[PDB]
């Protein structure tokens, strides 16, 4: 959608993309769509765009309405960055499954490190349905099949809680005592030791070893549950 | 003397320590946030960032300059024990809003995809360090120490069941990896991200340990620096 | 002395008004700098918000036409005692502006720049942070700057320097978008945070911790406004 | 007391003055000039690397530095109102004696290629900024957004003539490309030409008032750290 | 007290000299390092200047021999204020030699390079620059600063700082030449300006703003010599 | 008041001890970490020597115990003299630690690396350096500075600045051991020098410049127990 803003001629000579096939143009949200061609590296590289040592084949969509279900470049699946030579020709695939209804431009772009995003012809591609029908199926190596959507989602929600509610039961133990005003006279006057008694000192103490207890509890259990 | 009793100056002190108490928490909040995801939040942002190396080195390191800086007033003048805590209570909760509200509302990237660190350990550890030992120097020693150690161990428990190995389409992936693979990231190429890669001279299994000793080394200066900055913030010089 | 206009913070309102038209009308409508839908809902929102701000920074920055004889260090804990309270009720207004600028918008912006929109000559997502948020803090900011100058005893002695911090200081970062926009442009790093482009407002978050010296100041003349009064 | 008269004193004041303007003139004019012609001043020397992004964004930056340090004290001691004038009128007649005197008339390279920057413009308005408001910071933040923002349009209208494009031998070229092209620097290879270029992350004409805007944000913080440091030069501290 | 040695400058006409010598004998009679030619009217020309300077150096700082009792502070405006015109003479004499060695020669070497001459293993603009002009200006900068110590009353206290910059700080270029010719050579860049290595002598001419300090002292127990007769 | 406990330096035969041990059981006995030889002479050596410095500074460091009313300012020079040489033999102590631990031992690790073993997840030559010598050495310039905080007058003012840079500087470079083996993986450069995964603990050298400070002060009240008797 940004390509019409780069300049004029760094999107002439850099790569073209052609023999494009897009196998659908609807789809229903949990299905598959591919987006299959070629693209040919000019050796009239821009001087201010790294050459290509470092690409990444991506897809240019305004967040996971699709998600990347593969894709390859000559045959072979690319998670990762890979290399490119000036002056090739190389054949690419891709397979979108549909996630999120609505009316979507699904462009063919190629990030290139210490370049930038090279973004190819985009086409419109309408999803329909609803969201919360979307499943991202997996198994793992030891299967163990989850559902990659909303996994290890109630771990992090109790976590995060958890240690929220713990650092805020510390302020809470100093709230309730009048703060501020009667501090600032305390210290002022020479009577620094204001509101740190020692049972405010033991209650520092249980705090930091109940705190360093869990985190090795947790590491443990952690270890155990997933060895 | 023209209020009304004695205890009508305790209920005026009383609203306005709620009043300075939301100030400060807010101000701190907003300075601390942008702080924190302007120099070290990709880590924070991305579950496929948060690596044994890179992760563990560069978080407590930038994540400890607020909570020194405030404790350098908010404990040589009021005596307050936390500072720290409300630091990174500030911090997490704007992360939170943001994350769940725009990451997940307005974009829709899954929330098992972009949850925040967890900053509340090192901070509670560091609050109690200092209102012990009442020292600058020790506290800066001990908690930059605890504050750089106590970060993975925190974290672990929350990204751990997205550490399962996974063989997809013939290559092998965390399921990390996996969700970084599949929500596309359009800005995000995959070759930004900075994450532990090994080399030669790298060890089989040592990255999250020397990381988080490395990191503790060098929260023991940030600590340091970032007190005096924290007390010359706290000046009342006029110009 | 309070809870009147403390209650009356708009600021929700008006920023739930712009998260909603965010998410409703610059999702696709906004999608493409393009000419026609985008000029519309978001350009000329860009010249209003600057018209607007520009003369309502002028305008409400008009303490020092109320200002006058403030020696209510001289009263007793109730005319000066009243004014503490309202320049809290500013600081606390400030407050929530310095959130919604520099930490929700900020990241969502941050949130932005991930999925789509590459920053090349434009977003509308800091149209909304850059051209709204930011002058919106600074000029509720300067307000109790000039409030306090002009309102309270203790601060006629020339222009605190901490609570310039807490101002001018988170000033320097509207500024500062020209390092970005130039960093991001012939020296680009698309991230936030190694990018040492960003680096340049990374130095105005450290500046708004200028509210442990107004803090520090307004808890000194304070605290001899309930000395007396201890039980 | 000994002298004659009150009047003659006026007149001891005046040769004074006249003497003190001419060793302050020079002395700056040297230190100016070695310090621009040593920073930023490849892009003043020739046409052809009078660019939209680089020009910009150093000549205004480097060039506020001894306006502002000389402004530190010539105005807090003797309310002079000039004083980045004089800085600024001082290394344009050092410049263009060179120009014409030595790259001209030494080495013959046509004076239409060679001719110097303007900073007159930035140099007045700082000037008057500074005048009124009497206030460094105010001076600081909104005359160093004028300097970064008035260089490029008022260098315009001189480098306008040799922007018109030409097709040599099949190639495009700006006239100040032709020149660049014919007249050899046998030492000044083109790759070194640091001009912009053009990128994937670059806009289709955004480099002339990007780069003027960054370099005013830039000038504010420069001419800020020059107060003090002019500030220090005033010191008359013994040791 | 002066309209003397002020009008015979004779810098012009021995800078005068060299320029007309240098468009003369070393355009071509000094483009090659060779042995004769050069050697003859490069090498020469060098030794001579160094021995010449050396000497001239040793001799003219002698105020050390015309020094004396400098209680001029006690004396009317008539010995002292003549004494100033001195010094003041001496500071325009030494404002020439600053422009014409960090102005003058300085841009013309720049000239040089970008026509044929690469530095490598010498310029013969270099005995004109560095070997020349340099310490010419530093001769006079020290026979100002000696003037002052040994002749007026307020310089008496001990070596007034920014006197101290504005003399061997400008000083500190001429070593510098060791910065470059090394940057230059396993560093080089054939440029002036985003080389580094011409940041050396970059925090040289800073050091020249160090007449805000002489003219701030001068102008202090000047100003307490003119008080009475205001009109 | 000395000539006893400073002949009784055995830092020597200890340290003579492990130079032996050094080259007869971890030539090749420790050239592989591989599992039965290094873990038997080498491992074991590091966690006795971690649990026995651990507990020997938790005891030594009992000068707190020992510490009283040390007003021997108004004692003569016979009970504070006394003290002032138990301070400087623990200096001289302390001095023979440094000594062993930062050039020795550290330009003997030095010496390792380049020859066969890469730091790659160990070394056996920097057990006896980072985690022998440096606490040794951190053990004796805690207990020098104790000593004096606990019984000398001069020293009851509040913890002598440069007595700390003495002290915990030098304990800094033992954290620094993180940025080593840290910018020896990941950022590795094979030298000592140009690799500033170094400059960590070079800045803790410096910092063993403290003994400047120490000597002002242990040579002004000590100054003054000696005027008198000049002669
Ligand atoms: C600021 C702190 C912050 C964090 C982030 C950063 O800085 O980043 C990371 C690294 C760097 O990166 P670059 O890419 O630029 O470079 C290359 C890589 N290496 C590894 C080789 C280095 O850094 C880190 O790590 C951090 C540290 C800091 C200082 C000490
Ligand atoms: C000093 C100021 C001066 C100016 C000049 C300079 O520096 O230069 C320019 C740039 C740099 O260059 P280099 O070649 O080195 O590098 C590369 C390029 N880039 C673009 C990538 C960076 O820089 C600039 O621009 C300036 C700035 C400054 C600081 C802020
Ligand atoms: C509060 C002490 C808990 C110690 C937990 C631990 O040893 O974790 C080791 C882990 C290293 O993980 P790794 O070497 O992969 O082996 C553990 C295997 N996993 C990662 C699966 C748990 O990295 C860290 O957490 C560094 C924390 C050091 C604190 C002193
Ligand atoms: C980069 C860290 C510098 C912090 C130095 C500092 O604490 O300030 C001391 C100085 C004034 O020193 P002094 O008059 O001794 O007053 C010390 C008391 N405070 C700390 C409140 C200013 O204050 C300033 O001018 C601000 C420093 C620059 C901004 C980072
Ligand atoms: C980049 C960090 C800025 C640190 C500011 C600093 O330490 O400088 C203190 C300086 C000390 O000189 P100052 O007190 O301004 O001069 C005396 C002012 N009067 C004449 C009213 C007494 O005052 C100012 O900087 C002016 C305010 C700057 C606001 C961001
Ligand atoms: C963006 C609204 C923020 C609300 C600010 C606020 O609550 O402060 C109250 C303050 C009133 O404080 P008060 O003590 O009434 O003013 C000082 C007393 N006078 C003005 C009579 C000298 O308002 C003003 O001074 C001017 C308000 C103009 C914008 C709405
Ligand atoms: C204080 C910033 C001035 C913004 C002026 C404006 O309304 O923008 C129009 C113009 C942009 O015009 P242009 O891109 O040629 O065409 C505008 C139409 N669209 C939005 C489709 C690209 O902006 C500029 O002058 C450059 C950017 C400001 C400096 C950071
Ligand atoms: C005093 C305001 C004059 C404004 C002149 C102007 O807008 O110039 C735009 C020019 C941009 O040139 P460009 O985008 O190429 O479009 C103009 C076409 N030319 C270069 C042929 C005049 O870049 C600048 O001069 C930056 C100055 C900004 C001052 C607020
Ligand atoms: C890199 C900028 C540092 C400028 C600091 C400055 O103004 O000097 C303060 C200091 C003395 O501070 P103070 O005794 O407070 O006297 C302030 C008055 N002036 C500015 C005349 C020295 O003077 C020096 O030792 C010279 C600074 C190093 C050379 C760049
Ligand atoms: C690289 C910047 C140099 C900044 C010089 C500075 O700030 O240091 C001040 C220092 C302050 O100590 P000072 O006043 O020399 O010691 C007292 C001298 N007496 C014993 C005569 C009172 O004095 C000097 O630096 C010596 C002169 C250097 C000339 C370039
Ligand atoms: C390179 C020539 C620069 C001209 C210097 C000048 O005009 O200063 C006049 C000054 C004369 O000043 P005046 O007040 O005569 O000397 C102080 C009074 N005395 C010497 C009797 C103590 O000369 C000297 O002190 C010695 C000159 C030797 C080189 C030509
Ligand atoms: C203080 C500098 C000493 C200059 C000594 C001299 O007269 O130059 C002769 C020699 C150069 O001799 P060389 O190049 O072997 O042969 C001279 C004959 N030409 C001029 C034909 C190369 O210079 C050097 O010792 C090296 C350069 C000085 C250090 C910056
Ligand atoms: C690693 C051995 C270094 C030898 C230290 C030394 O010679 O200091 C002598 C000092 C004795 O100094 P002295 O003046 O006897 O002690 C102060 C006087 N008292 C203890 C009675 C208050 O010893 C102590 O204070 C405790 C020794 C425990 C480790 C062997
Ligand atoms: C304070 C350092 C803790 C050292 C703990 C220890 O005894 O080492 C065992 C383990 C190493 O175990 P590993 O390499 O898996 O196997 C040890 C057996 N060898 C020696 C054959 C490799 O060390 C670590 O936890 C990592 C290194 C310390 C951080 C700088
Ligand atoms: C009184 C302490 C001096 C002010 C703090 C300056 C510290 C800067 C270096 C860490
Ligand atoms: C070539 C890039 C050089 C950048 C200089 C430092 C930028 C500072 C940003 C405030
Ligand atoms: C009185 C002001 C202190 C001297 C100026 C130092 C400023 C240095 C940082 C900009
Ligand atoms: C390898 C080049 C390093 C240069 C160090 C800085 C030079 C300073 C010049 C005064
Ligand atoms: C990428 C390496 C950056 C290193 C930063 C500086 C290290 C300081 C060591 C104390
Ligand atoms: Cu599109
Ligand atoms: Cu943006
Ligand atoms: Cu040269
Ligand atoms: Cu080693």
Not at chain 1, 170 to 197: E, H, N, Q
Not at chain 2, 17 to 32: C, K, P, R, S
Request: aromatic letters at 18%; one cysteine or more; charged letters at 15%.
């Amino acid at each position: 959608h940004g390509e019409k803003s780069q300049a004029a001629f760094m999107r002439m000579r850099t790569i073209h993309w052609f023999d494009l096939n897009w196998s659908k143009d609807q789809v229903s949200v949990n299905e598959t769509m591919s987006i299959s061609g070629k693209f040919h590296v000019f050796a009239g590289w821009p001087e201010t765009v790294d050459k290509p040592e470092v690409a990444f084949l991506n897809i240019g969509i305004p967040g996971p309405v699709f998600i990347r279900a593969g894709s390859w470049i000559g045959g072979q699946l690319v998670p990762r960055s890979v290399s490119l030579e000036l002056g090739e020709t190389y054949e690419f695939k891709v397979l979108l499954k549909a996630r999120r209804p609505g009316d979507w431009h699904v462009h063919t772009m190629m990030n290139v490190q210490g370049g930038g995003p090279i973004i190819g012809p985009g086409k419109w591609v309408t999803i329909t349905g609803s969201m919360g029908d979307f499943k991202n199926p997996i198994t793992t190596l030891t299967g163990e099949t989850i559902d990659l959507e909303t996994y290890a989602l109630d771990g992090v929600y109790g976590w995060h809680l958890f240690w929220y509610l713990l650092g805020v039961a510390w302020m809470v133990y100093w709230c309730r005592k009048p703060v501020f005003i009667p501090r600032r006279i305390a210290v002022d006057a020479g009577k620094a030791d204001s509101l740190i008694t020692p049972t405010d000192k033991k209650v520092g103490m249980a705090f930091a070893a109940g705190t360093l207890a869990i985190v090795a509890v947790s590491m443990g259990q952690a270890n155990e549950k997933y060895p | 003397s023209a209020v009304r009793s004695r205890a009508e100056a305790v209920k005026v002190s009383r609203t306005f320590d709620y009043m300075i108490l939301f100030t400060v928490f807010f101000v701190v909040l907003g300075g601390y946030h942008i702080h924190y995801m302007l120099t070290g939040g990709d880590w924070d942002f991305w579950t496929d960032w948060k690596d044994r190396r890179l992760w563990v080195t560069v978080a407590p390191i930038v994540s400890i300059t607020f909570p020194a800086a405030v404790q350098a007033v908010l404990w040589w003048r009021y005596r307050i024990a936390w500072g720290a805590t409300l630091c990174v209570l500030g911090l997490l909760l704007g992360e939170w809003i943001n994350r769940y509200f725009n990451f997940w509302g307005w974009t829709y990237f899954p929330v098992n995809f972009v949850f925040p660190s967890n900053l509340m350990p090192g901070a509670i550890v560091l609050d109690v360090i200092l209102m012990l030992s009442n020292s600058m120097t020790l506290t800066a020693v001990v908690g930059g120490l605890a504050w750089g150690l106590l970060f993975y161990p925190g974290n672990w428990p929350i990204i751990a069941p997205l550490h399962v190995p996974v063989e997809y389409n013939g290559m092998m992936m965390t399921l990390a990896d996996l969700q970084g693979y599949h929500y596309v990231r359009t800005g995000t190429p995959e070759y930004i991200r900075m994450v532990e890669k090994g080399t030669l001279r790298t060890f089989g299994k040592d990255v999250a340990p020397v990381s988080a000793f490395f990191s503790g080394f060098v929260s023991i200066l940030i600590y340091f620096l970032w007190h005096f900055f924290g007390s010359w913030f706290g000046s009342e010089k006029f110009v | 002395k309070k809870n009147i206009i403390a209650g009356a913070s708009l600021y929700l309102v008006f920023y739930a008004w712009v998260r909603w038209y965010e998410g409703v009308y610059g999702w696709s409508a906004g999608l493409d700098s393009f000419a026609p839908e985008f000029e519309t809902y978001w350009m000329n929102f860009l010249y209003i918000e600057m018209v607007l701000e520009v003369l309502v920074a002028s305008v409400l920055w008009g303490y020092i036409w109320k200002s006058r004889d403030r020696k209510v260090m001289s009263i007793t804990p109730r005319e000066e005692l009243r004014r503490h309270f309202t320049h809290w009720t500013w600081l606390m207004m400030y407050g929530i502006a310095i959130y919604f600028g520099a930490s929700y918008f900020t990241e969502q912006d941050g949130t932005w720049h991930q999925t789509i929109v590459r920053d090349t000559d434009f977003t509308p997502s800091h149209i909304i942070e850059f051209y709204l948020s930011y002058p919106i803090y600074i000029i509720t900011g300067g307000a109790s700057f000039l409030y306090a100058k002009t309102r309270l005893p203790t601060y006629q002695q020339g222009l605190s320097l901490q609570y310039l911090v807490v101002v001018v200081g988170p000033f320097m970062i509207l500024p500062n978008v020209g390092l970005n926009e130039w960093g991001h442009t012939f020296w680009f790093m698309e991230e936030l945070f190694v990018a040492p482009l960003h680096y340049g407002f990374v130095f105005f978050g450290w500046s708004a911790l200028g509210v442990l010296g107004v803090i520090n100041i307004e808890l000194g003349a304070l605290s001899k406004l309930l000395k007396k009064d201890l039980a």
